């Protein structure tokens, strides 16, 4: 997941993840949170932060992100894998 | 590019590619390692 | 000319009186159960200890290093 570190993460404002521990379709959002909270991607900017929200009766692995342009991007990883959402977020943060 | 019959990687960033009928060794870190198959 | 040369003139008793040296009674007994000269091999440790596996891993690392000397 070094592409997200080589690209950049400055214009982003606040990101967060929500999932359930007992579900069997929460590994994608789990590894996404693990890759997005590394060392290079976290030290490339200090004006942003992450929120790790863990609920029991959520029953949905939704990941909502937004940057400084006032937009909003929410991606629920119910069936998507990790690389797909990673490259989607990369393209969305590079194009805007 | 340099004409070389036996191609090999001289460092780490060298990646092998197959183009226009010849194997070429491109590298972005050390451009001196560009080889051409004869 | 600068160099850290602070060799104290110790003879036979200046190494126990200059510093607050404690007798053997106050020191615990488990501090003398360590190794002395030669280290530990592989046939002296039981396979149910971490030291044997660490020594085997170090030997494997040494073998890999001795093998990967000509390839690129």
């Amino acid at each position: 997941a070094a592409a997200l570190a080589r690209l950049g993460l400055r214009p982003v404002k606040q990101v967060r993840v929500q999932f359930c521990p007992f579900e069997k379709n929460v590994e994608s959002t789990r590894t996404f949170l693990q890759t997005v909270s590394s060392e290079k991607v976290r030290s490339t900017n200090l004006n942003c932060s992450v929120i790790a929200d863990v609920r029991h009766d959520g029953s949905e692995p939704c990941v909502d992100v937004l940057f400084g342009d006032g937009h909003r991007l929410i991606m629920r990883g119910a069936h998507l894998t990790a690389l797909e959402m990673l490259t989607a977020f990369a393209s969305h943060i590079r194009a805007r | 590019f340099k004409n070389k019959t036996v191609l090999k990687k001289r460092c780490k960033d060298c990646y092998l590619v197959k183009r226009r009928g010849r194997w070429y060794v491109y590298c972005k870190t050390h451009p001196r390692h560009k080889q051409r198959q004869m | 000319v600068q160099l850290t040369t602070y060799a104290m003139g110790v003879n036979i008793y200046k190494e126990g009186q200059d510093v607050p040296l404690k007798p053997d009674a106050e020191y615990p007994e488990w501090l003398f159960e360590m190794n002395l000269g030669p280290p530990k091999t592989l046939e002296e440790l039981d396979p149910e200890s971490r030291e044997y596996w660490r020594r085997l891993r170090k030997q494997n690392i040494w073998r890999h290093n001795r093998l990967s000397k000509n390839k690129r």
Binding site: - | - | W53, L56, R57, Q59, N60, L67, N70, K71
Partner: protein
Amino acid sequence: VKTLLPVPSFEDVSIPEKPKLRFIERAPLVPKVRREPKNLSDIRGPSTEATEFTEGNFAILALGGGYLHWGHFEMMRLTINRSMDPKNMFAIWRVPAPFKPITRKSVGHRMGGGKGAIDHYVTPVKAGRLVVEMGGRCEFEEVQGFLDQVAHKLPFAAKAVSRGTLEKMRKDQEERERNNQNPWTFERIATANMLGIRKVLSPYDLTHKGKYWGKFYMPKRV
């Protein structure tokens, strides 16, 4: 997790004195006053002596015939001394000193007037003869590497094999030679004289079994 196999311990192989190779001179201690002809039968066919190992476990197996002069021996000994470990590796020469005289005449001279003068000396090397033997307390990758590095420089074909590798290659060779589909072996046709083939063949082919030709060696003839 993965398993951790024990490393092969080296405690029964002691390095002797002088681990490096000795010096090879050009002419011997006494010159040969009698000029000998260039007998080509000293490199044609399989090798007789210096076939198996003796002390070490790694040696260069020759796959062809040829002559080696002083420069080749110097290059080989220099490469060995510069690409080895004196505290872990040691090699012993397997081929003797070059002693076969070669007569060369003057440049731009008419045909005649007897033979020329003896210049350099070479040594006969047959196929399957171990050129150099090296042992020690090392493994198989590095030694095979810096032995094939020299074998590729040799004029004739040569490879870096050991004991287990030689055993395996002989095993697969005999397996391929004992499991032949077509029932027309070169030996059966050469020995029994079939279709009058003995007219264009050679009497030395009865022992070579079609595996040798002049100085080369084809391991795929069967």
